[PDB]
Ligand SMILES: Cc1cc(=O)oc2cc(O[C@@H]3O[C@H](C(=O)O)[C@@H](O[C@H]4O[C@H](COS(=O)(=O)O)[C@@H](O)[C@H](O)[C@H]4NS(=O)(=O)O)[C@H](O)[C@H]3O)ccc12
């Protein structure tokens with residue numbers, strides 16, 4: 001079904017320029033199904049492409065293969081983790097030989113545990129574990145073909161991700177303790193997303209919960225399938241218009257700091273809470289400030305009371321709600337009742353907070369998600 | 384009733400995420416689109432991408448292991 005396919009120097013330059021000019025760090029997957037006779041990896045094609053990028057002054061990190069677990073299904077070849085481990089050492093040698101010897105290497109981009117991936121990853125990390133700067137794995141909650149609206153709003157679906165992550169950390173801790181763990185490709189639903197679901201406000205429960213849980217459980221980097229493309233899980237549509245997950249992804253970057261803390265509800269399935277230090281790059285916010293974010297999957301509004309000593313602090317609300325009439329199936333979203341649109345092709349809107357009456361409880365409508373910045377929190381940890 | 388009390392842990396960072404914590408992919412599938420050049424050229428799309436800096440852009444997917452570099456190809 002899947003056939004080999006060539007790509008030009010122009011393809012590479014296009015892709016490099018897009019990243020460089022957008023301020024993003026390109027990671028390039030190399031063809032790991034190029035095999036020598038002895039079923040080892042053939043590096044010559046990859047060798048051509050290292051040579052070209054090095055000649056051009058291209059700062060790029062590298063991967064080798066995507067979901068080796070199913071090379072047997074995809075191309076009638078089984079590659080064991082040990083060999084894929086050896087194949088990664090071969091490639092790491094070439095990067096050390098090459099002009100960017102400090103070049104970072106990520107792998108092996110295996111699917112989630114439920115796809116019978118544990119052995120392959122453990123064998124891979126025992127063998128190749130030393131040369132890779134992060135372990136990459138993939139997660140999708142659902143099949144795009146069968147995913148329902150109810151699936152997207154189901155806390156029992158969101159919770160299976162917790163076990164996926166615990167299982168990955170179990171393999172890694174038994175092989176390369178303290179190695180960084182990255183979600184290398186992840187979204188709502190495989191097969192290119194759930195039509196009229198993966199591209200809506202409804203996709204945001206799964207995206208924001210994945211982000212909260214990944215941060216809480218020790219995932220360092222989450223790579224969203226996809227920024228742009230054919231799949232319904234794209235952040236940007238085919239007309240280059242941002243979908244609700246774009247605005248969510250932007251508001252997360254503005255408000256959420258790198259320092260992960262914890263929140264919990266005293267009652268804990270349909271009210272999902274996450275706490276980090278505020279991103280202080282926002283001139284509005286200073287060190288010690290907290291960013292709370294919350295998902296409400298109840299069908300009624302909930303009123304969150306801040307714990308002592310934060311009950312009386314000034315809180316900025318960033319509440320995200322669909323623009324009607326399609327409700328959770330809408331491709332448009334309002335921040336605090338104002339529709340989020342590009343001001344023009346050059347210009348993102350401001351993201352206006354809504355300051356709350358100090359000492360008021362935090363209102364979170366049914367089927368919504370919100371950020372709350374607790375100003376003058378003065379959390380020493382947030383320094 | 385619909386009033387919920389939160390508990391916070393604020394003693395120390397439990398984890399440190401990369402500044403590029405929220406990163407993004409382009410699927411390898413997209414390098415097999417005729418319109419590829421046009422799409423990544425979009426200055427609108429670049430406005431949108433810049434708003435996500437800092438982040439990794441991962442180029443990969445099923446086609447990763449079905450793409451062959453041609454230094455002779457256009
Ligand atoms: C069986 C299964 C379970 C699972 O949890 O994850 C999977 C991920 C899979 O594949 C992985 O997840 C994605 C997905 O599928 O959505 C694929 O996406 C591309 O390829 C898909 C074809 O899948 S494939 O069978 O031909 O590989 C297209 O439907 C999709 O639109 C396209 N992304 S796009 O941006 O270009 O639109 C990825 O390339 C691939 O790494 C494949 C199977 C599974």
Ligand SMILES: *[C@@H]1O[C@H](CO)[C@@H](O)[C@H](O)[C@H]1NC(C)=O
Pocket residue numbers: 299300
């Ligand atoms: C919420 O869900 C329950 C299902 O048990 C339903 O019977 C109830 O009337 C719903 N409430 C609202 C406000 O829609």
